Amino acid sequence: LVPRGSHMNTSELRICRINKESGPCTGGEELSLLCDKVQKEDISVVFSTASWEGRADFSQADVHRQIAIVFKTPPYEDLEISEPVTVNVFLQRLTDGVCSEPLPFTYLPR
Amino acid sequence: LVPRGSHMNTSELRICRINKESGPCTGGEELSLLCDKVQKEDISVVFSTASWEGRADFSQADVHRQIAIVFKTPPYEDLEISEPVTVNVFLQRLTDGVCSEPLPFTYLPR
C-alpha cells in the first residue's frame, strides 16, 4: 500500500492493458481491459487527471473470466499454395482426446 | 460428446476466438486465442483439414488465466478540447477504495 495523491495504490490490483489507447472526448465509448485478480462485485474503473475524475460504466456481468493461449502456428502442408487456404483450428484434451468445435483460420501464400 | 470425423467433440472445450484470422502458410507465427475452461497441463491446439493435421507449439506457461472488463468510457471534462489530452485510467476496489497503478488513455477532439 503506497500513497498516491488522495488515494492508496496497491500491487494487488493491476491493469495489464486497454484494448484501445484513445477515443473521443465525448465518451460513451465501449472498451475493454485486461487485469489481474479483481472481484467483479467489488471493482470499478476510473479516468482522471490531477483535478478531474470520471467513472466508467459496467456491471458484474461485464467482468469476464477468460483464458488466453499464446502459441506458434504449425506450417501448412503445402508451402507452394498460390491461393488462400482456410483450415480448421480446434482444441484437444490430451488425456481423453476430446476436442472442441473448430474455428476457421486461413493460411496465406508466401 | 458427439462424433466428428475420427474424433470426439464436446461442448466442454471451446475456442471463443483467434486474435488473427489468417497468416503465412510458412507457420512459426505467434498467435493467441481465448477459450473457456481448459487445464493447461492437459490441452493442445490443432490445425487441420480432412486429410492433414498440424499442431501448434506452446507450453503450460503459455496458457494465461486473465480477466477482461468490458465498459463504457466516461466523457472528458472538456468537450471542446482542440488538442489530444491523455489522462490516467486505473482500477479501484469499492470496499476499501484501494487503487491500481494507472495506465494512459488519451481523449481525442470531436
From Swiss-Prot, chains A, B:
What does the PTM comment state? Answer: Phosphorylation at 'Thr-103' and 'Ser-573' is followed by proteasomal degradation.
Where is it made, tissue-wise? Expressed in intestine, thymus and spleen. Undetectable in liver, bome marrow, kidney and testis.
User: What are the subcellular locations of this protein?
Assistant: Nucleus; Cytoplasm, Cytoskeleton, Microtubule organizing center, Centrosome
* UniProt subunit comment: Component of the NF-kappa-B RelB-p50 complex. Component of the NF-kappa-B RelB-p52 complex. Self-associates; the interaction seems to be transient and may prevent degradation allowing for heterodimer formation p50 or p52. Interacts with NFKB1/p50, NFKB2/p52 and NFKB2/p100. Interacts with NFKBID. Interacts with BMAL1 and the interaction is enhanced in the presence of CLOCK.
What is known about what this protein does? Answer: NF-kappa-B is a pleiotropic transcription factor which is present in almost all cell types and is involved in many biological processed such as inflammation, immunity, differentiation, cell growth, tumorigenesis and apoptosis. NF-kappa-B is a homo- or heterodimeric complex formed by the Rel-like domain-containing proteins RELA/p65, RELB, NFKB1/p105, NFKB1/p50, REL and NFKB2/p52. The dimers bind at kappa-B sites in the DNA of their target genes and the individual dimers have distinct preferences for different kappa-B sites that they can bind with distinguishable affinity and specificity.
The Swiss-Prot or TrEMBL note on domains reads: Both N- and C-terminal domains are required for transcriptional activation.
Protein name according to UniProt: Transcription factor RelB
Q: Which organism is it from?
A: Mus musculus (Mouse)
Mapped onto the parent protein, the portion here is 277 to 378 of 558
